[PDB]
TrEMBL record:
Pfam families xref list: Abhydrolase_3
Keyword Hydrolase: yes
Protein name: Hydrolase
Keyword annotations: Hydrolase
Origin: domain of life: Bacteria
Organism whose genome encodes this protein: Alicyclobacillus acidocaldarius subsp. acidocaldarius
Family per record: Belongs to the 'GDXG' lipolytic enzyme family.
Domain Alpha/beta hydrolase fold-3, residue spans: 75-283
InterPro entries: AB_hydrolase_3, AB_hydrolase_fold, GDXG_lipolytic_enzyme
GO molecular function (one): hydrolase activity
Length: 308
């Protein structure tokens, strides 16, 4: 059998067989993905509802993993996608793993996208969503002292910024920040080595990166706006401990490293690990690539330990 497919099959075949005798069309459509076949870890409960915010309503999909007792630790998650693409479905498989393996209730936030909603729309949504969810901790039986923020790529940037805004605003309390190959920014004058090193051939290219910025940002001066490039924020001290994952063949590899450095220098506990054989956005290859699969689960387990 074709090797690549056989790998995907192995992942699907090891999971519990569905009870097709009592499976609704709605369950099949949400629990199974065939285009392409991507494994969706089963969770105990999946709820989707609106967050009525000033000027806009954001949808949120909440994943409660099986075998976890309340008060539950939680993760407010912001999907990647260059602030232009992605939604609740594109990262559904990722959130299911973070809930399942992270042993936490995940809240995937469907923040406004650019160019329709340019910077800093996503940033206000990220923070507001966190505030909306944390103040309703009881509604979801969450442990308010164990609410973390996280995201991949643009989402990791949003989670990083949200932590800073939360500090400046005096709340809500954030216990941890999970940054998956986050675009935490850098001094455009001195671009890290990975920028030019991995500018081509590895999915996220220099052209695509810059195209994302044209869609997201308003002015050239915003390239150094702390809510876009948090690594430039003056005082990173007091921020939630963090875990940063970078990919060897990611132009943003050193960008993540750079934020890890700033956090540590700022006295913030921070763990960072580079995945030697992966590219940017590797989480999207969950179950498709053995390396991406193992990497994401490890990441999920780091979240588990931090909120344990």
């Amino acid at each position: 059998l074709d090797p690549v497919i056989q790998q995907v099959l192995d992942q699907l075949n090891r999971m519990p067989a569905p009870d097709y005798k009592h499976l609704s069309a709605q369950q099949f459509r949400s629990q199974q993905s065939l285009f392409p076949p991507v494994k969706k870890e089963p969770v105990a409960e999946v709820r989707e509802f609106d967050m009525d915010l000033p000027g806009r309503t954001l949808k949120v999909r909440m994943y409660r993993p099986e075998g976890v007792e309340p008060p539950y630790p939680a993760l407010v998650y912001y999907h990647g996608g260059g602030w232009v693409v992605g939604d609740l479905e594109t990262h559904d498989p990722v959130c299911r793993v973070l809930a399942k393996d992270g042993r936490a209730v995940v809240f995937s936030v469907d923040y406004r996208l650019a160019p329709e909603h340019k910077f800093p729309a996503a940033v206000e949504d990220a923070y507001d969503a966190l505030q909306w969810i944390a103040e309703r901790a009881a509604d979801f039986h969450l442990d308010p002292a164990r609410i973390a923020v996280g995201g991949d790529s643009a989402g990791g940037n949003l989670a990083a910024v949200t932590s800073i805004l939360a500090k400046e605003r005096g709340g809500p309390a954030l216990a941890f920040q999970l940054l998956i190959y986050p675009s935490t920014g850098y001094d455009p004058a001195h671009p890290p080595a990975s920028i030019e090193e991995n500018a081509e051939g590895y999915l996220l290219t220099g052209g695509m990166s810059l195209w994302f910025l044209d869609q997201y940002l308003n002015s050239l001066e915003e390239l150094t706006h702390p809510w876009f490039s948090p690594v430039l924020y003056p005082d990173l001290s007091g921020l939630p401990p963090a875990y940063i994952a970078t990919a060897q063949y990611d132009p943003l590899r050193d960008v993540g490293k750079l934020y890890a450095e700033a956090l540590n220098k700022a006295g913030v506990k921070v763990e960072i690990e580079n995945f030697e054989d992966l590219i940017h956005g590797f989480a999207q290859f969950y179950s498709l690539s053995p390396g991406a699969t193992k990497a994401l689960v490890r990441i999920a387990e780091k979240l588990r330990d931090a909120l344990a």
